[PDB]
Point group: D3
Chain length 305, copies 6
């Protein structure tokens, strides 16, 4: 009784997930009216079904989120059994954007409350900030991780002497975990006092790890700082290729030799033109997670022995 | 303790209302981040205050609505006393858009629930469809009407022998009311069997009345149909100048001599270039309504003796 | 696991539905105490069952609605699995009753909220005003239509040259739909300027169509107006036989030759004494709808090819 | 900013309260439509006001309760500041009606939830069962007592040697309290094994005390049982004169010399014809309670030194 | 799909129930941090399962209740299907504790609301005060009774001429029911004017019945009062052995020959040292109730033919 | 109309705040029953008042939290106007306690929801983790900071050459802020690879800064690590003196010369016996914050020019 629907944010990823589930996307016409309002209508029978909506809240964030909530409402009024919102990238949840006024909203809370109000039953995201936002949901949240796929790709290319360098001081726990998993290699930290790199970096291959790349910026500066001191090659691995701002003149005019990202965001054409940017796929893991959520099997058993 | 804030949809109308209230707009920086997410921060002290947010949900509808709800959340977390959302045009509430699938959402209900969830205390709209949407709100809704201003402008230009013609069959009650108010003049109906005009139209001045103009379309066709039979001049009066689609080649290539609208929507530049389109202002009525809501005075006493 | 319960509004219709489902009504003693309060007690085991309550909110409206909500509460506290309220006629939902004070409640909203609060999971009505009230429910609403049965009875009696006449101007969409379905016959409108009948009516058989008959009134006046100009016979078809006020001296002292109604309201004895009033039955359609709701089958597939 | 409104249950008591507050009842037309649905419309301006609704939920209980909730909704949608429901007698709250099925609703809970849902802010009742029902309300409940007025009337008529006799075993705490207050007189209990009267009753004046009289019944039987053994006179004092069933042939064909009740229920004409039934008034206490609730003064200071 | 979890209040009773269900307690580490906060973590996979939590809210009440709600939250965030809270003794629900200030909370309501908020779906208690507290829950409550087991143990020891004596006047209904069930024996009441025992007690065996024993106190005084007049033996039967205060010097320094209680509370060691205190077990009835709740079978059919 | 109430967690701090407000604590008897349940009763009249409850949720956490929610319920049922919960230390909110099972509750969310459910209107805490927990509250939260008082005490004792050292890597932002405020002194970090101290520490006075001290532990180890390399004196400044575990043998058997804490937790006697532990007071700041919250003045204006 599992049915898959998709919006307009990630149609390719939705098609890949549908292919790996040996099914097809549902028949729903999701489009825009003349004045810009979201138009949604369901042409299938979804009564009592187990519905999954694959809709990342990537740029344009507001249109995608409105599509998501309007589809949820249309499916809830059509007597759908359970609605799961598969959101590969959760939009209004970034923590590294704080302009100092102290009178600011909590937009992740707003989005979580609106999702719960419109009728969402479950959430399945990828690499959420798994310390804060899971408390904003009154519905169960299944957070799956893109780290295993990125790490299994890291092990493929046979780095000389890998060292994991966190691009900043906030994200050192993830770097430590990846370093421990990756053959228990060495450890390094970039600190912005200028740059204060901590550890030994000389004649090695560095692997910067992050959950996001917005405008290059911090990653490009960290790569430059640790390549000033004779790092052989610099590989930057990220899960969410937001690539806003310029992010195409920052990557080209940089010393990073390869940026590896996942396919949670469509990765617009100008980035595709770059030669040193390669994208992985989360379709297999997301399909397995969807199948296990539908059948009430252990999601955590997918990531550990 | 009344404070006024504005977003980015209607900044001119908000400034006019603030001028007529002998006050100034509050200091809130409402803008966009690099990736398109709404950024809101309040630079004033709004603790215990009586806050009004002037934000029409016009095109682009989703960005404007997200600005509105994010401002409401930011003000609610800043210990604002009461939050009133002054929405001159309510976006996802049109009834004349029905594509036949029968599995469709009720978007006005979704917007009303999200407004109530984020922390809105009152709503003040202009010319809402005052039979359905007021039941979707669990907060009080003050619906003020743009009919008195349009009618007082109608009486100014000294029509030869005015006759009120409803552009379609759904909106005949409003046409009857305006005809009764306007010196108890004659009555006519356009019916789409082709066009089936009902009543006497010959050597008179016709005044089409509607609450909205989207793409010309129905109004242009009605004007052509009733000018086939020797109508002297045709004036179309509307409250909400949505003007989507073309709405600039429809108006120019038409026989309408003057289109009079209100200022609930910014009325983009290409429409401004047209010579036969003139806009009124609702700033005085909205300012009086805001002042009466703040002081708990009779709003209905503003429109009747 | 389907169980059927009934109150005191429509016991005959409930028995007919139970007969067509090859089952029997549940054992619940629904009665009145000495002081007039509703007494409800369930003598069956309804734990985990799929419960349906057949209770029209017809006159006396308040007693019937109180019976309905008290039965819902009694079944919800008895660990019933799902409760569906089959309401053939929704009571506080009429739109053609507006006395002008502008300070009035929305009673349909009140009833919907109270139904949702007491523990109703689904609603199944017949010929609701399917543009407004479905937004007042936060539970799914299945609106089934009595039009197919009335129309299939219309086609039986072999009208000479049928023409569909809407009794007023508000309900012209339904008349147009029925005219299109009924061999694509002609079209006519009654307008109250006196009566302003639009179209050709002479030597034909007219079929007035409405969703309700309260006191004769509008239908009797329309029949008189269109029989002034040589209409052969006049048949009035309605879904809800409210028949309040007099509605028995209006029908007898009228020129309508046959009034055909459905059995959503018990149709009290004085109306039964009339010879020109004949009632159809919705028991088959309601039984099929109940069976399809219980088994999660397509309700819309019942009404279209 | 205090305004008083009334329904159709207790219009005389509402008028008395309005007279003692030196004000007048608000202008609201509360009536019935042709089909029996409650019609409510507010002809006053109640924006920001402090509204009190005086509406007992006495027989007919369902119509009165529907009037109450419809008035509450009409006032809440008219931007009323605070709504207090003054309910002199709470209807669906009796505990001495238990038919043994164990699958029964809790109707007091249903009424409390519906009152809270429709928009009631406070409740002010008289002689509620102040151990259970106050937990069913999520709004503050002010329970005032009719005991002081009944007791001050008891002390007036100069009983020979008063003894307080509880009509049954459940209500012995109230009898003990009244006996302690009434000059610390003696104590007696009626027990239904036949009747098992406990204590000394001979040559004395007995004063049965209860919060309600439904059909005579228990009180008449207790009076007969304790007058079998030479009780001089028997006075029955109650707060709520429900007087359902017969309650007019039970009182006449009884040995009770005087039944004293309050005016929370209109006390229909046949009871008025009886000579041995006298009614007190709670209008003064209710007016003082309303005035103290509006001004945020101590209600409990009204009943104690 | 049934899983059983336990806290730290009643681990022995939970183990007995798990043994009678031919299963084992789930793997959850419920403990305390250094500062006293409750630590809970689930080491099993409970996705989609039917979870039961066996946790009495006995002394220490606050720690046990916090353990219960924290386990409920941990299981709800782990995608548990349905959570049933098996609470053999409900803590904040006693009615025989009223200190006179009239400004007091309703703690049973607070606990019920917090249980409903944290995510509890059903409640299964033993010998609750089944007239008030069941209305405080918006989730179904299954109240099972320890009376059959106590009564079947009463019939075992072959009393000479049993007479059921209620320890006070409030609990006479339960005493009457047990007397009717126990061979329809005689009836007696203890009344505190000193003690006013009602009925014949001489040369008989008395069986005091209560739902609770807190500090001896009332039961010890009643036993002394009815043994002043030549009662052969006095047996006190209770369901909840709270045994607070002293309750060990009251029982030893008393004339009660045997106190029989159930195992809803762990019955601390000093009480175990007493020779005249014997405990029964509710594990069989609770296991049957759990099995019937999981399989949606009639609970009431467990207690009657 | 401001009234102050206190529980049993922090009676001294509550008395100090009441003294600085020139008022007295309200008359509420907050105690324990025999079985350990919280007993609360209000002996004052709090109708319409502006109530503040000063109750830290410190050890024993569960008893203190239950006292808090029971007082809130008792005051809400007594018609209190607004209830503000002044919680100097929020209990179930620590983030540095993560045992790895991934099936764990979010206890801060549970406490926030229960506070909102029982009827709390506002929260005023001290040095909360101001990035996560403020989103768990649907009521406004006023987070005041103990940093200004600790820093003004730091500047008093005339350190030789102060350097701020963060005890770990998570809390480096607060250390950077305090270093910038404290004459823009130098910066250092302790990193646990053993200890990896970053920066220059030799012949200086180090000032470790943290929001909490639980068991010494991390702070003692950091002090030892940075005193291995010739630090003159080591001062540890904290806001919340939890001091659980041993925390009295860790501090004595350490090289820290002075531990300065605030008075949000009663700081039990064994810690008082230590000579090198000195406590500050937040009573002035909390009194000013309470006064400004009551009068709707700017709280943020208290901490900045």
């Amino acid at each position: 009784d599992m049915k898959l629907f998709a919006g307009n944010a990630t149609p390719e990823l939705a098609q890949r997930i549908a292919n790996r589930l040996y099914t097809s996307l549902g028949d729903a016409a999701v489009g825009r009216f003349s004045d810009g309002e979201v138009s949604v209508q369901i042409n299938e029978n979804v009564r009592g079904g187990d519905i999954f909506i694959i809709q990342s809240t990537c740029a344009p964030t507001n249109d995608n989120l409105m599509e998501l909530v309007v589809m949820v409402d249309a499916l809830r009024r059509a007597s759908a059994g359970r609605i799961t919102a598969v959101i590969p990238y959760f939009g209004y949840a970034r923590q590294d954007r704080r302009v100092r006024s102290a009178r600011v909203p909590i937009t992740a809370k707003v989005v979580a409350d609106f999702l719960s109000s419109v009728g969402v039953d479950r959430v399945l995201t990828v690499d959420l900030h798994a310390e804060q936002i899971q408390g904003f949901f009154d519905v169960p949240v299944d957070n799956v991780f893109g780290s295993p796929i990125l790490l299994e790709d890291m092990l493929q290319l046979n780095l000389d002497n890998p060292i994991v360098v966190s691009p900043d001081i906030g994200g050192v726990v993830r770097a430590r975990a990846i370093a421990k998993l990756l053959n228990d290699t060495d450890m390094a930290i970039i600190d912005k006092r200028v740059m204060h790199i901590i550890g030994d970096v000389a004649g090695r291959d560095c692997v910067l790890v992050d959950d996001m790349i917005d405008t290059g910026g911090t990653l490009c500066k960290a790569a430059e700082a640790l390549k000033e001191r004779g790092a052989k090659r610099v590989f930057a691995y990220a899960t969410h290729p937001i690539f806003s701002g310029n992010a195409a003149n920052n990557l080209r005019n940089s010393v990073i030799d390869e940026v590896v990202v996942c396919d949670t965001i469509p990765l617009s054409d100008e980035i595709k033109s770059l030669p040193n940017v390669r994208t992985l796929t989360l379709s297999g893991m997301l399909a397995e997670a969807i199948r296990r959520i539908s059948n009430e099997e252990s999601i955590s058993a997918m990531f550990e022995h």
